[PDB]
Amino acid sequence: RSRLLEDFRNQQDQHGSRFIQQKLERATAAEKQMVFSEILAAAYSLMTDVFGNYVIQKFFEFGTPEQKNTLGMQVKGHVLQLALQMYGCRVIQKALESISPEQQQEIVHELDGHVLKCVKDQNGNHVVQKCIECVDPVALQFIINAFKGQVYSLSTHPYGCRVIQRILEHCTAEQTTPILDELHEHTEQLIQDQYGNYVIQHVLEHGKQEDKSILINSVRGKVLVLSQHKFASNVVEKCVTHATRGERTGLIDEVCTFNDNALHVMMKDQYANYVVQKMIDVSEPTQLKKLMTKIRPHMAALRKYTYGK
Amino acid sequence: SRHCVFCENNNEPEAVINSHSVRDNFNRVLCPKLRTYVCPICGASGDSAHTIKYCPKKPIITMEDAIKA
RNA sequence: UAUUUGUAAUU
Ligand SMILES: [Zn+2]
Ligand SMILES: [Zn+2]
């Protein structure tokens, strides 16, 4: 048959897989069941294929769901092995949106307590996020219960912060609440971290108002210190935008009382000027005019930089 | 592009702006005006040159340092 | 004259 491989190379291979993709929309269902029945044998090895996985992905939709289930069973028993594998996990995450929610729940029950070494993989985190988006949050209570004591240590993790945002965006109140309090504990250190600022930033533009009130109250006193910091400056940015008029006024009045030269540190420093800019376009004309008449002289120190204000 | 920005912000003639790019292909500083400038804080120059506002040792200033000065 | 404006894991 390899003689026909070199008789078609003269005109699992990218040509054959992508032509399968562009002609799977045609042909007969008898050929569909033909190939599917020709794969059901040992698909456990066909998952970890660089371009067989394109084919598996493409067929997880155009076929009758019977093939989705019958091939679904030819996977369980080896999920902890195929979840870390690159192409296997592309197959998985591209397959969790086509099967039935029951088989989905079977997959969720396949891995419990493993979360530790799962998101701590280059491939496990993507699948975890895909499941937090797909699977019902109530079935993922093992995630919320696998993080007791593990919230602060993994919220600063690069693969961890993504999963944290996915949990906070696709869950109920009972699931988002305990992790949210775990975040309210270590806030002052999370902001300083390169990935805690993604988490807090995601909170300020998604969560309930009350969390934003708590966090804003846990900042009043660190405006110049964090606007001068590298990552925290974004927290200040996306913090002054999403706020009530009363909190905007509170922080604005907390800034305009800076010791003059502190305003010079604001305008000069490589980060605080963003805080100034995004602070301009949220305030009411009352506090806006009370800030125009406050740092107007320092303006005469930005015409040499790149600020056309 | 093939042009720098540092020389553009300092209003150098239009040929100097388009003469060099801001940095190297290896994040080495390339603009000769910036490579000349020795950092008054961290002392570095040339490949790792930078101005004061962007110095890695530019200290974080609290409200206390704003009261005492 | 010190002047460039600033963050995220895979086919
Ligand atoms: Zn230059
Ligand atoms: Zn320096």
Residue numbers in the entry:
A (entry chain A): 1092 to 1102, 1121 to 1418
B (entry chain B): 316 to 384
What did the publication describing this PDB structure actually write?
Pum is a founding member of the Pum/fem-3 mRNA-binding factor (FBF), or PUF family, of eukaryotic RBPs. Pum binds with high affinity to specific sequences in target mRNAs and represses protein expression and enhances mRNA degradation. Regulation of hb mRNA by Pum relies on the spatial distribution of Nos, a tandem CCHC Zn finger (ZF) RBP.
Pum alone did not form a stable complex with CycB NRE RNA (left, and 6B), but remarkably, addition of Nos ZC resulted in ternary complex formation with an apparent Kd of 12 nM (right, and 6B), similar to the 8.7 nM Kd for hb NRE2. To gain molecular insight into how Nos enhances Pum recognition of different NRE sequences, we determined a 4.0 Å crystal structure of a ternary complex with a CycB NRE RNA (5´-UAUUUGUAAUUUAU, core PRE underlined). In contrast, Pum appears to bind to the CycB PRE using the 1 repeat:1 RNA base PUF recognition mode with R1271Pum sandwiched between bases +4 and +5. However, for the CycB RNA, recognition of +6U is suboptimal and the +8U nucleotide is disordered in the ternary complex. Nos and Pum recognize their respective NBS and PRE elements; however, Nos recognition of the 5´ NBS and clamp-like binding to Pum and RNA relaxes the sequence requirements of Pum interaction with the 3´ end of the PRE, as with CycB mRNA, which effectively shifts the recognition sequence, rather than extending it.
